[PDB]
Amino acid sequence: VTMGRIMRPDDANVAGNVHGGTILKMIEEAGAIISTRHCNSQNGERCVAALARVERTDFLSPMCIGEVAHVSAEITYTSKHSVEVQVHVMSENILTGTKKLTNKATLWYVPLSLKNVDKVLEVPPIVYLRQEQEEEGRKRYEAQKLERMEPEPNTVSYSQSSLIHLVGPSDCTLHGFVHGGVTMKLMDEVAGIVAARHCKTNIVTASVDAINFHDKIRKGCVITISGRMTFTSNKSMEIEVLVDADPVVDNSQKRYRAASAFFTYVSLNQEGKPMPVPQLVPETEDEKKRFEEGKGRYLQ
Amino acid sequence: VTMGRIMRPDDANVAGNVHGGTILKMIEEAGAIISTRHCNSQNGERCVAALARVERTDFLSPMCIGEVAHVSAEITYTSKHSVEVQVHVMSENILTGTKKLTNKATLWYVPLSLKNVDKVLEVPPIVYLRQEQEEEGRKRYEAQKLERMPEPNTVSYSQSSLIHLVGPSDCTLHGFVHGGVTMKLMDEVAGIVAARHCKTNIVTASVDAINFHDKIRKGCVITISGRMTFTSNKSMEIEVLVDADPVVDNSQKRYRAASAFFTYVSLNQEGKPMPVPQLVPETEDEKKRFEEGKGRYLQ
Amino acid sequence: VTMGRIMRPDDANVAGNVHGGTILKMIEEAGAIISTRHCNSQNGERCVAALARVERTDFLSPMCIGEVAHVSAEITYTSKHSVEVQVHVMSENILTGTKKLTNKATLWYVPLSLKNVDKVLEVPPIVYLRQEQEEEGRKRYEAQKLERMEPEPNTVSYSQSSLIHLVGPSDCTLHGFVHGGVTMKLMDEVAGIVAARHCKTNIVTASVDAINFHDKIRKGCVITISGRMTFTSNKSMEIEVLVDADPVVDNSQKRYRAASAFFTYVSLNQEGKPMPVPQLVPETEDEKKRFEEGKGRYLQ
Ligand SMILES: CC(C)(COP(=O)(O)OP(=O)(O)OC[C@H]1O[C@@H](n2cnc3c(N)ncnc32)[C@H](O)[C@@H]1OP(=O)(O)O)[C@@H](O)C(=O)NCCC(=O)NCCS
Ligand SMILES: CC(C)(COP(=O)(O)OP(=O)(O)OC[C@H]1O[C@@H](n2cnc3c(N)ncnc32)[C@H](O)[C@@H]1OP(=O)(O)O)[C@@H](O)C(=O)NCCC(=O)NCCS
Ligand SMILES: CC(C)(COP(=O)(O)OP(=O)(O)OC[C@H]1O[C@@H](n2cnc3c(N)ncnc32)[C@H](O)[C@@H]1OP(=O)(O)O)[C@@H](O)C(=O)NCCC(=O)NCCS
């Protein structure tokens, strides 16, 4: 699968840097296609790939308005029930001929029966070229599968932000449920705002930390994305984003945590270089704890 | 000053009733065009009409997915610096031929120089047919100009806020936000507040007059917070407040961009307004607002 | 240069048939990229390809919500100042594996200097494999270049429709001007409505006639697209769409005709595929003239 979009002004901030989420949403659409295709290639029961996991990912070069984003997405492994997908995102400038690699990314998709909602299915095998690929896939397939068992300025409340979104039909999969990209894009929107509130300047997504997608969200759910700062290095900003879901339609289905992530953001020079960041000053018990966990995550 | 949109599923809730804000945004785009055209018809300095006021407005019939919304927008009056615009919004069903009037609406626009930001200009005269039109315009032009001088079923249970970074397609050809973009975001919030409370399908029944105090620039992050005030047996008042932070400037401080009361209705699976769970104020300010809300609801 | 993307409910009518315009816009974005790239490949003065012409084009199979549209776009010829581009559009259903060809299409782009607005430039030569390609290109490059030196139900007023659009920044190429796709999409939106009003049923774009793009439209222009029926065969509907532009700003300039086209539309069964169409009954002089010109065009 492959990639064409020319980045419009709506894909980017006022200073013309494309939003991290904008790229995240494209990556996912690519992944979602290649994987739903292949999960129906052996012609079992009809399914749809749903985004389950995304690996850490760093934004190498900025992308700008007018550049074409190229998105190539290959399947790298399968397990019994999961599909690994790696994705490369490259920015072509078509005036100067220049190219840069913006982004590598790895994703984990899982087929859900279209007939039986919530029924996981089996992922057909893929044909490799060497064993080392399958092993490297299995080691990475283990490494993820293990980790899954495990108001004052410059203060966290000053920049704290939340956003609320009613899930519409084009947010959703052909079935009632939301895309991974729709979610990831809304998360960046929030973290982005948190970051900007704090820095009081231009900002861009430098990196995103592994995400896991716990549960589905249905059409008509109103989802709330709340985001708050955790850590600051001299030149960066960690931001915890939490995503909750209320089904308003049902009295007997109670709110739940759909997903959560840490987003790192960068300030930028009017000239186009990362600048030093105003330092976050925790105050409560939990604030320093999270600031410390945030130094910890930031190292690894 | 005429139309055709056909209402897609993204224009409407899961039950297929078009969003109030979806209509509000179409009404405004119409008003914004006709008025910016006419404010450049005598060929003075180059300007852009900016939405200053919207009159009370009630949603008469529902509009549904697949129906064509027709939006006709006529200029009804001018003052020295303002433009009255009336807008009719009519829903055609194109399977059954049926038509309904969804909405009349009146809007007040004001030309701002494109060269000189913040410089109000003069609105050319329009040609009427009778004097009674101009008088009725002047009386209405005065009438506005005078008026301008967590427990379930509790307000905190349904309280909701939304935060939006103003992008380029939100804005006018200049740094500033459309009236329709704002009105649509307000309905998004009030809509959610309403739904949280009712726990059912809901639609915008009416919107009170709104006044647009100040501009909002590209790059401003705006926060729209909405909370219930009053409940009649079958309706829901919802106060929506819209604040603006320019994040870029340290020394330009937050401000209140606009505020409004939105009234919302629950609907029977069968398609009829039904009784609403009653809001129970608790604080001083909650009963005050509940009472002001009975007061507004009468008039 | 090619890609595809998954068709959301926003890409399609209530009955889930993708809009003709939706496809037209994708075709153009593809064409616009490949051609602006190549017009800067020999590294002259910096330019942007602008859509000048689109050939007749017919919609072979319908496309539905959930299907992936694949758009491949190759350069087929160049002249001194113009670029031919052919585009294939194929619909993959990713539940059933099925594929169909939806659409072939040919487009003519022309580089305009980014520094000097309105300054046409020269198109680098392309490397062919056989001469017959270049000749077939030249014959088609001539064939176009020649042709360019030339309220009662079921009545035209009943279905007549117009739409008015303020040109925003994301409608535009980086420079002040509108995309060909933006225009083509708005034209279909209107013709689509005209068709639906008349049939009183589901409808889809069956075909579109060659379009020529006379003049540019700038950011901030308000454009009016008016559409009205001309002819009806037993099973089809011709619809004339006219596109006017007012520069409301710097209004020493008067409104101008940006472009015009005839769009043919088809009614469809719930089962799907074409039904007989209520017959249009002209009434004025000009209505029968256009009804007759419409029989004439419909033959050839
Ligand atoms: C993915 C999902 C269906 C798993 O369902 P479940 O009832 O927990 O079933 P399990 O956890 O046993 O999942 C079975 C497979 O899921 C995989 N899986 C579950 N969570 C995962 C994660 N976070 N990352 C990668 N794989 C995951 C397991 O690796 C397992 O595969 P294997 O058997 O081949 O090793 C569930 O997490 C879900 O509903 N996710 C939401 C999907 C979605 O809506 N995406 C967008 C949301 S914003
Ligand atoms: C409309 C606006 C320009 C008025 O500016 P101001 O500094 O109040 O200027 P003035 O008081 O001299 O008003 C001049 C005219 O504006 C009209 N006006 C101002 N506020 C108004 C309101 N709320 N409703 C109707 N008319 C209004 C006056 O009636 C007056 O016209 P007149 O002289 O013919 O009676 C200003 O309030 C503004 O910029 N508003 C925001 C516009 C905008 O950005 N809208 C979109 C945001 S969502
Ligand atoms: C295309 C355009 C630049 C032509 O300007 P012009 O003043 O006619 O310039 P010229 O006639 O010298 O054009 C030279 C080349 O243009 C090409 N051209 C112009 N109009 C064309 C048409 N309608 N179809 C095909 N080719 C066309 C010719 O093929 C010619 O190439 P050649 O010299 O190699 O044979 C002008 O019509 C324009 O700017 N149109 C709008 C472009 C645009 O904005 N498209 C989207 C609109 S919604």
Q: Chain C closest CA to A46's CA: distance in Å?
A: 6
How far apart CA A132 and CA B298 sit, in angstroms, is: 76
How far apart CA C281 and CA C230 sit, in angstroms, is: 10
Which residue intervals of chain C are DSSP H helices? Answer: 20-38, 131-147, 156-159, 180-199, 285-299
How far apart CA A228 and CA A232 sit, in angstroms, is: 12
Q: Please answer yes or no on whether A169 and B10 come within 8 Å at the CB atom.
A: yes
Q: Is C52 helix (H, G, I), strand (E, B) or coil?
A: strand
How far apart CA A7 and CA C24 sit, in angstroms, is: 18
Q: CA angle, B73 as apex, B67 and B75 as ends, to 5°?
A: 170
CB of C148 sitting under 6 A from ligand 3: yes
Q: Write out chain C residues lying below 8 Å of A95, CB-based.
A: 36, 40, 46, 114
Q: Is B289 helix (H, G, I), strand (E, B) or coil?
A: helix
C107 closest CA partner among C187, C63, C52, C185: C52
Chain C residue at shortest CA distance from A26: C5
Find how far residue A27's CA is from the centre of its chain. 9
Q: Chain B closest CA to C87's CA: distance in Å?
A: 28
How far apart CA C29 and CA C44 sit, in angstroms, is: 23
**Looking at the CA of B260, which ligand is closest?**
2
Q: Please answer yes or no on whether A166 and B218 come within 8 Å at the CB atom.
A: no
| Neighbour-count burial of C111, counting CB atoms closer than 10 A to its CB (0-12 exposed, 13-18 middle, 19+ buried) | buried
Q: What is the helix (H) or strand (E) element at residue B104, kind and residue range?
A: strand B99-113
Q: What is the helix (H) or strand (E) element at residue C128, kind and residue range?
A: none
Chain B residue at shortest CA distance from C221: B173
What are residue C161's DSSP bridge partners?
Answer: C227
Q: How many Å lie between the centroid of ligand 2 and the Cα of residue B110?
A: 6
Whether A278 and A252 have beta carbons less than 8 Å apart is answered as no
Whether A177 and A233 have beta carbons less than 8 Å apart is answered as no
How far apart CA A262 and CA A291 sit, in angstroms, is: 12
Map tokens 């760093």 to a residue: A58
What single letter denotes the amino acid at residue C267?
A: S
Whether A224 and A244 have beta carbons less than 8 Å apart is answered as yes
For C174, list phi and psi in degrees, rounded to 5: -60, -35
Whether A35 and A75 have beta carbons less than 8 Å apart is answered as yes
How far apart CA A223 and CA A258 sit, in angstroms, is: 9
Q: What is the DSSP secondary structure assignment for residue A18, as one 8-state letter?
A: B
A274 closest CA partner among A234, A235, A239: A235
Length of chain C as a residue count: 300
**Looking at the CA of C175, which ligand is closest?**
3
Whether C298 and C238 have beta carbons less than 8 Å apart is answered as yes
How far apart CA C7 and CA C9 sit, in angstroms, is: 7
CATH of C1-156, one of 2.40.420.20, 3.10.580.10, 3.10.129.10, 3.40.50.300: 3.10.129.10
CA distances from A148 to A137, A184, A278 (A): 17, 19, 34
Q: How many Å lie between the centroid of ligand 1 and the Cα of residue A35?
A: 14
For A246, list phi and psi in degrees, rounded to 5: -110, 120
Q: Helices C20-38 & C180-199, crossing angle to 10 degrees?
A: 170
Q: What is the helix (H) or strand (E) element at residue B237, kind and residue range?
A: strand B235-245
Domain A151-300, what fold?
Thiol Ester Dehydrase; Chain A (3.10.129)
Q: Is A300 helix (H, G, I), strand (E, B) or coil?
A: coil
Point out the residue among A10, A196, A220 whose CB comes nearest to the CB of B247.
A196
Other beta carbons less than 10 A from residue A285's beta carbon: 8
By what technique were these coordinates determined? X-ray
How far apart CA A174 and CA C9 sit, in angstroms, is: 8
Point out the residue among B14, B161, B164 whose CB comes nearest to the CB of A220.
B14
The maximal CA–CA distance of chain C, rounded, in angstroms, is 59
C185 closest CA partner among C18, C14, C32, C25: C25
Q: Chain C closest CA to A245's CA: distance in Å?
A: 22
Q: How many Å lie between the centroid of ligand 2 and the Cα of residue C177?
A: 31
Other beta carbons less than 10 A from residue B219's beta carbon: 20
Q: How many Å lie between the centroid of ligand 3 and the Cα of residue C215?
A: 9
Considering the domain C157-300 in this protein, what is its CATH number?
3.10.129.10
A/B interface, count of CB pairs below 8 Å: 65
Q: Please answer yes or no on whether B162 and A164 come within 8 Å at the CB atom.
A: yes
Burial readout C164-186 (b: 16 or more C-beta within 10 A, e: otherwise): bbbbbbebbbbeebbbbbbbbbb
CB of A106 sitting under 6 A from ligand 1: no
Q: What is the helix (H) or strand (E) element at residue B228, kind and residue range?
A: strand B221-228
Strands (E), chain A: 5-6, 47-54, 57-58, 68-78, 83-92, 99-113, 161-166, 203-208, 211-213, 222-229, 236-246, 256-267
Whether B57 and B103 have beta carbons less than 8 Å apart is answered as yes
The resolution, in Å, is 3.1
| Neighbour-count burial of C260, counting CB atoms closer than 10 A to its CB (0-12 exposed, 13-18 middle, 19+ buried) | middle
C15-19 CB contacts, 8 Å cutoff, 24+ apart: C15/C202, C15/C268, C16/C64, C16/C65, C17/C62, C17/C63, C17/C64, C17/C202, C17/C204, C17/C268, C18/C62, C18/C63, C18/C64, C18/C65, C18/C67, C18/C69, C19/C185, C19/C188, C19/C189, C19/C192, C19/C205
Q: What is the DSSP secondary structure assignment for residue B214, as one 8-state letter?
A: S
| Pocket-testing residue among C47, C110, C138, C165, ligand 3, by greatest number of atoms within 8 A of Cβ | C110
Q: Please answer yes or no on whether A9 and B245 come within 8 Å at the CB atom.
A: no
Q: Write out chain B residues lying below 8 Å of A163, CB-based.
A: 162-164
- Give residues preceding each break in chain C, C–N over 2.5 A: 150
Domain B1-155, what fold?
Thiol Ester Dehydrase; Chain A (3.10.129)
Domain A1-151: state its class.
Answer: alpha beta
Q: Please answer yes or no on whether A43 and C174 come within 8 Å at the CB atom.
A: no
| Neighbour-count burial of A170, counting CB atoms closer than 10 A to its CB (0-12 exposed, 13-18 middle, 19+ buried) | middle
The structure tokens listed for B54 are 């919207």
How far apart CA A209 and CA A33 sit, in angstroms, is: 23
CATH of B156-299, one of 3.10.129.10, 3.30.930.10, 1.10.3720.10, 3.20.20.450: 3.10.129.10
The structure tokens listed for A107 are 């994703």
C71 closest CA partner among C150, C173, C1, C2: C2
Find how far residue B3's CA is from the centre of its chain. 19
| Pocket-testing residue among B25, B81, B222, ligand 2, by greatest number of atoms within 8 A of Cβ | B81
Map tokens 């809730």 to a residue: B13
Domain with CATH 3.10.129.10 in chain B: 1-155, 156-299
For testing contact with chain A, the best of B7, B162, B163, B199 (most A CBs within 10 A): B163
**Parallel, antiparallel or unpaired: strands B5-6 and A211-213:** unpaired
Please report, in angstroms and rounded to a whole number, the separation of the first and last CA atoms in chain B. 31
Whether B58 and B203 have beta carbons less than 8 Å apart is answered as no
Length of chain A as a residue count: 300
How far apart CA C271 and CA A6 sit, in angstroms, is: 37
* Dihedral sign (CA A217, A223, A228, A233): positive
Q: What is the DSSP secondary structure assignment for residue B129, as one 8-state letter?
A: S
For B297, list phi and psi in degrees, rounded to 5: -65, -30
B246 closest CA partner among B177, B172, B169: B177
How far apart CA B85 and CA B139 sit, in angstroms, is: 15
Catalytic residue among A11, A171, A188, A244: A188
Tell which atom from ligand 2 comes closest to the C-alpha of B211.
23
Cβ within 8 Å of residue B44, ≥6 positions away = B121, B122
For B251, list phi and psi in degrees, rounded to 5: -95, 45
* Dihedral sign (CA B5, B9, B11, B13): positive
| Neighbour-count burial of B280, counting CB atoms closer than 10 A to its CB (0-12 exposed, 13-18 middle, 19+ buried) | middle
Cβ within 8 Å of residue B4, ≥6 positions away = B68, B70, C161, C162, C163, C190, C193
How far apart CA C235 and CA B260 sit, in angstroms, is: 51
Q: How many Å lie between the centroid of ligand 2 and the Cα of residue B56?
A: 18
Strands (E), chain C: 2-6, 47-54, 57-58, 68-78, 83-92, 99-113, 161-166, 203-208, 211-212, 222-232, 236-246, 256-267
B13 is catalytic: yes
Point out the residue among A163, A169, A220 whose CB comes nearest to the CB of B163.
A163
What single letter denotes the amino acid at residue C174?
A: L
Whether C264 and C237 have beta carbons less than 8 Å apart is answered as yes
For B157, list phi and psi in degrees, rounded to 5: -60, -45
Point out the residue among B14, B163, B191 whose CB comes nearest to the CB of A219.
B14
Q: How many Å lie between the centroid of ligand 3 and the Cα of residue C240?
A: 22
The structure tokens listed for A64 are 């700008």
How far apart CA A35 and CA A23 sit, in angstroms, is: 18
What are residue B207's DSSP bridge partners?
Answer: B57, B262
What single letter denotes the amino acid at residue B232?
A: S
Q: What is the DSSP secondary structure assignment for residue A195, as one 8-state letter?
A: H
Q: What is the helix (H) or strand (E) element at residue B36, kind and residue range?
A: helix B20-38
What single letter denotes the amino acid at residue B101?
A: L
Find how far residue A245's CA is from the centre of its chain. 17
Other beta carbons less than 10 A from residue B18's beta carbon: 24
- Give residues preceding each break in chain B, C–N over 2.5 A: 149
Whether C62 and C205 have beta carbons less than 8 Å apart is answered as no
Find how far residue B179's CA is from the centre of its chain. 8
Whether B198 and B266 have beta carbons less than 8 Å apart is answered as yes
**Looking at the CA of A210, which ligand is closest?**
1
Which residue intervals of chain A are DSSP H helices? Answer: 20-38, 131-147, 156-159, 180-199, 285-299
Length of chain B as a residue count: 299
Strand order of the β-sheet with C83-92 is C2-6, C68-78, C83-92, C99-113, C47-54, C211-212
